[PDB]
Design a protein around this ligand. Structure first.
Ligand SMILES: Nc1nc2c(ncn2[C@@H]2O[C@H](COP(=O)(O)OP(=O)(O)NP(=O)(O)O)[C@@H](O)[C@H]2O)c(=O)[nH]1
Ligand SMILES: [Mg+2]
Lengths: 138, 206
């Protein structure tokens, strides 16, 4: 209640946390809703909402996709772009693209079918264009 | 590398959205089907802050009497709690005192957040005016929605600031480690192919 009383408190030191993106160039950054296919129940499940990025390392020129959730900033997608990936439209939805990747959002590699949805068809077309431009430069 | 662990007990009436709230933080999904929790389900949630990663071990308890399980037995050694109710169901708010009474009986002065869920629904029954229980007990209250994610991170940010004693604590971008180039297993190649074909016939939730 009101007034003096003891509470258990754990004091922690400040830490400099690196994002892991310091050495990469932003080729694409737009808001999106990411989905993941759950084969056990045959459903697309929401995977995160935020900015999805196509990043390229300045030095080694490696290209990956990275996305973080809003407000919590946790990773919901983290995978390199390969020449074998096929980014296709999801015909049964609007402004949606589908592809398969070995993703590391949860700390370990998991093969996943992903679907990304953008605000406009225009942004979707720009994502698919930048995605395929990175593939051709492989 | 979690600097600290905290046991968080999540309580509230059945159907208020506790399991949906936790799953949203765990996987980012929004589960629409109501499958009642049987007793408890424990899930870890890690948040990265300017003072390191903080892990909450969330004890998501059952709100239905018939599925209560240990009930207050799950509260032992709890360091914080969330009481959830439904702003479209007055009875869930009417029972908030009972949940709070059961929590303090076992844990006493732990930080507790009161959450009114499902504020995305237009036909709101428990108006912001009628919510006065947080004042009568000195709890932190947030309107939240697991469907729209409105304020869905505030209960953990506040509990973190209370347990760590840092009013300026912030959530920060978790390190996004550059992933290695893995060659996919040719054995499961046919399975990945079938899954993709079925997925291309199924539409996104909304
Ligand atoms: N419109 C809306 N529905 C929600 C929201 N959060 C949860 N729901 C829905 O409410 C129902 C109850 O979800 P659930 O999380 O299982 O409830 P619970 O509090 O865990 N129940 P129990 O105590 O039985 O385990 C589900 O149909 C879920 O989709 C929300 O913010 N908005
Ligand atoms: Mg539940």
């Amino acid at each position: 209640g009101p007034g003096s009383h003891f509470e258990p408190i754990v004091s922690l030191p400040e830490v400099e946390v690196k994002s892991g993106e310091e050495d990469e160039e932003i080729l694409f950054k737009e808001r999106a809703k990411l989905y993941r296919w759950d084969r056990d129940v045959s459903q697309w499940k929401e995977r995160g909402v935020g900015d999805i990025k196509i990043l390229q390392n300045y030095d080694n020129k490696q290209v990956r996709i990275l996305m973080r959730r809003d407000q919590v900033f946790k990773v919901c997608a983290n995978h390199v772009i390969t020449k074998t990936m096929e980014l296709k439209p999801l015909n049964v939805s609007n402004n949606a693209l589908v592809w398969t990747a070995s993703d590391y959002a949860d700390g370990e590699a998991k093969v996943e079918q992903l679907a990304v949805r953008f605000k406009t068809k225009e942004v979707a077309d720009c994502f698919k264009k930048t995605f395929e431009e990175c593939q051709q430069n492989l | 590398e979690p600097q600290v662990q905290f046991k968080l007990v999540l309580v509230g009436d059945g159907g208020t959205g506790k399991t949906t709230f936790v799953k949203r933080h765990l996987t980012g999904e929004f589960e629409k089907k109501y499958v009642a929790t049987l007793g408890v389900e424990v899930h870890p949630l890690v948040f990265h802050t300017n003072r390191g990663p903080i892990k909450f071990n969330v004890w998501d308890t059952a709100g239905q009497e018939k599925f209560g399980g240990l009930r207050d037995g799950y509260y032992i050694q709890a360091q914080c709690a969330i009481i959830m109710f439904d702003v479209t169901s007055r009875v869930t708010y009417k029972n908030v005192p009972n949940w709070h009474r059961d929590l303090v009986r076992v844990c006493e002065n732990i930080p507790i957040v009161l959450c009114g869920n499902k504020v995305d629904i237009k036909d709101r029954k428990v108006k912001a005016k009628s919510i006065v229980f947080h004042r009568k007990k000195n709890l932190q209250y947030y309107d939240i929605s697991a469907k729209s994610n409105y304020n869905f991170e505030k209960p953990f940010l506040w509990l973190a600031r209370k347990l760590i004693g840092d009013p300026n604590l912030e959530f920060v971008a978790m390190p996004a480690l550059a992933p290695p180039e893995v060659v996919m297993d040719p054995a499961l190649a046919a399975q990945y192919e079938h899954d993709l074909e079925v997925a291309q016939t199924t539409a996104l939730p909304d």
